[PDB]
Structure 1
Amino acid sequence: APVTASIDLQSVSYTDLATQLNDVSDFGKMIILKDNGFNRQVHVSMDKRTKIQLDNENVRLFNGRDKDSTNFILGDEFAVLRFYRNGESISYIAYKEAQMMNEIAEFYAAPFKKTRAINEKEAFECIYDSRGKYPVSVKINVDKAKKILNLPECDYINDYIKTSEPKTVYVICLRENGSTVYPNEVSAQMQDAANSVYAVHGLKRYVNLHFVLYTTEYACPSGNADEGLDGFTASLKANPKAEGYDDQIYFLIRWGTWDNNILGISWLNSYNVNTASDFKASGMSTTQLMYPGVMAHELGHILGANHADDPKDLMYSKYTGYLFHLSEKNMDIIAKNLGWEIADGD
């Protein structure tokens, strides 16, 4: 007493998440996450470093403290709660509209109907209100989902081609022609990409990332990622809508992957705050939920990060699901490309 605000994960809906996250002021807010056998007190704060628009729809990000291992996403149409528990990433995805929530629930349920696992509920679960019934959200444990599904191993081998006020850098994401992407999925990739940068050498002092999403007429002419990125970068130079923004970062996004289960690709060490030009800082990325951190990994390459030898590094040559740079060499390259110097400290 006074009663701390809480989120009941057995019935969490869009309106539950929106009313709690919209109450988060400048000083932050304590929110207890609750479920059967689970509790977590999280100090939630507004992410003021990153801006996101998806087809002009404003998307706000929220963080917990480092020890909370919790992030949120909030748009007018959907909300996401994502946290780490016993080394696994769990997302609660809630769409405001009943039709879209039903469509999202069916989309995420569909891969599990052929397997029909006994422990399906720990990987995927439709959540219903505490009062037929239609789901108010879906729970997806991506790590448990990967163990139930027989997904072909998608990786990052050869996913790069060699060539007082923070600076605002736009990350212009373009929905590939003919591709369908989900806002919860695109925004999670953006959030992980931005947070992988800010976690390095206090880089929020140097850069604030502004993600935007639009549709492009460009489509990769084949399944080949190298040919796809070549064409994407060429399409940007010939696009009148991109005129005057050749010094920003660009991503072609899709739901799927490229040939040889390539998750994404980018021009290596192609963005520097002083010399950025000719749409060089460009890449491609999947946005599917089961591969978190692909855009973060490709943004890493664009900022100069090479593949790292630690299997827990975001920049490991194989896809792992780890979302942070662990390589000190990569951290120094990335931070120096964003204007940081060793004498500035962290």
Structure 2
Amino acid sequence: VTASIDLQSVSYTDLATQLNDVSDFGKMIILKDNGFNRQVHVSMDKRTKIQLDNENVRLFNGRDKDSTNFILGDEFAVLRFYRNGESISYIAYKEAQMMNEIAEFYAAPFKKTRAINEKEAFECIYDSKYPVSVKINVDKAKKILNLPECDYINDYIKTVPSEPKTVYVICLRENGSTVYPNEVSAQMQDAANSVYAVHGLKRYVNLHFVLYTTEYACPSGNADEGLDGFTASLKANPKAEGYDDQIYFLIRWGTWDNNILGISWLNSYNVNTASDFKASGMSTTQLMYPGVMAHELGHILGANHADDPKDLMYSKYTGYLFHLSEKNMDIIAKNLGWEIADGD
């Protein structure tokens, strides 16, 4: 009997038991949903490392055709897959108090209004009572909640190895900000996978995300002023001494003035010349805006805004998570040590 996950009752223990059994060779897992099943071949993601306040977070992938990824920490697990182009997440926290808190947090925006189609956008999942997970379709949720259109308008400021190079992405929880591990990890996973999908870049780089708290807080709602202050705080921080050549993000749950989702120094990271904390940006981590860190990481690696409305780098926020621009893909890969003669 093939291993399975029942999406009508999926808990943290269910996801952890299955994902912890994934060996080097991968594992078939059936996702079961109202009598319809999806067989996914799950593998450990060996390219990316993540710590959130030193808590280890592991990533898992399906095959490209499976359009499925997982996240696993000691405290939470995530299953994220697509249906009719929409992003559906199952988020399960291990501790009952935290699972109850998370369920209330995600349910609260929907309680203000009373949608007739609320369950397809948001649903508390119970064991076959307190919730064991939540199901959120962020595309459907954004249509019900009628959120202000947060975009990427002026979200940037201008200024073959045998072993991939490790590049740390040092994320710093802004002073006074509260972020949720499932949300931060999802941004990190989408950011890393947007890079590996380009020109076989896992041969050149392995991204290592870490999360700490910083004393820095943006002095205003302005993203440009905030990024200026953030990069200045890194240069003056004794804790960052010796790491001026890594990538940095100031993260928060919310957004900046003019519904700016994030901002970064354009074309500020190159594997040979990285220095002076230039490769820095800021990003929201809220669930309803997947791919913001990926978009900002794209700018740091040199990607400009793209003309295809399905591109991660489109000037408007779309929810698409991959680079489609060949010009951007070449710029990003060249900044990470790739050359055309190396192929994909």
Partner Cα distance (2:59, 2:315) in 1? 29
The structural deviation recorded for 1:277 is: 0.0
Partner Cα distance (1:39, 1:45) in 2? 19
Partner Cα distance (2:141, 2:222) in 1? 27
Partner Cα distance (1:314, 1:42) in 2? 25
Q: 1:149 aligns with which of 137, 141, 145?
A: 145
Partner Cα distance (1:116, 1:184) in 2? 26
Partner Cα distance (2:125, 2:256) in 1? 33
Partner Cα distance (2:332, 2:178) in 1? 31
The structural deviation recorded for 1:38 is: 2.9
The structural deviation recorded for 1:39 is: 1.5
* Aligned residue number for residue 56 of structure 1: 54
69-78 or 35-44: which moved more? 35-44
206-215 or 30-39: which moved more? 30-39
1:65 aligned to 2:63? yes
Partner Cα distance (1:174, 1:87) in 2? 31
Q: Deviations over 1:154-207 (max 9, x none)?
A: 000000000000000000000000000000000000000000000000000000
The structural deviation recorded for 1:150 is: 1.8
Partner Cα distance (1:335, 1:272) in 2? 10
**SS of aligned partner of 1:111:** helix
| TM-score of the superposed pair, with normalisation by structure 2 | 0.99
Partner Cα distance (2:105, 2:26) in 1? 34
Partner Cα distance (1:146, 1:169) in 2? 34
Partner Cα distance (2:286, 2:154) in 1? 20
| TM-score of the superposed pair, with normalisation by structure 1 | 0.99
Q: Deviations over 1:61-95 (max 9, x none)?
A: 00000000000000000000000011110000000
| Alignment gaps of 5+ in structure 2 | none
* Aligned residue number for residue 253 of structure 1: 251
* Aligned residue number for residue 88 of structure 1: 86
For these two proteins, the number of residue pairs brought into alignment is 342
| Alignment gaps of 5+ in structure 1 | none
Off by >4 Å, runs of 4+ in structure 1: none
- Taking only aligned residues, the RMSD between alpha carbons, in angstroms, comes to 0.4
**SS of aligned partner of 2:131:** coil
Matches within 5 A, 1:1-346: 3-130=1-128, 133-163=129-159, 164-346=162-344
Partner Cα distance (2:3, 2:310) in 1? 34
Partner Cα distance (2:197, 2:305) in 1? 18
The structural deviation recorded for 1:114 is: 1.3
Partner Cα distance (1:311, 1:321) in 2? 10
**SS of aligned partner of 1:185:** helix
Q: Deviations over 1:185-240 (max 9, x none)?
A: 00000000000000000000000000000000000000000000000000000000
The structural deviation recorded for 1:37 is: 4.6
**SS of aligned partner of 2:103:** helix
**SS of aligned partner of 2:51:** strand
Partner Cα distance (2:269, 2:37) in 1? 42
Q: Deviations over 1:227-263 (max 9, x none)?
A: 0000000000000000000000000000000000000
Q: Deviations over 1:5-52 (max 9, x none)?
A: 000000000000000000000000000001115321000000000000
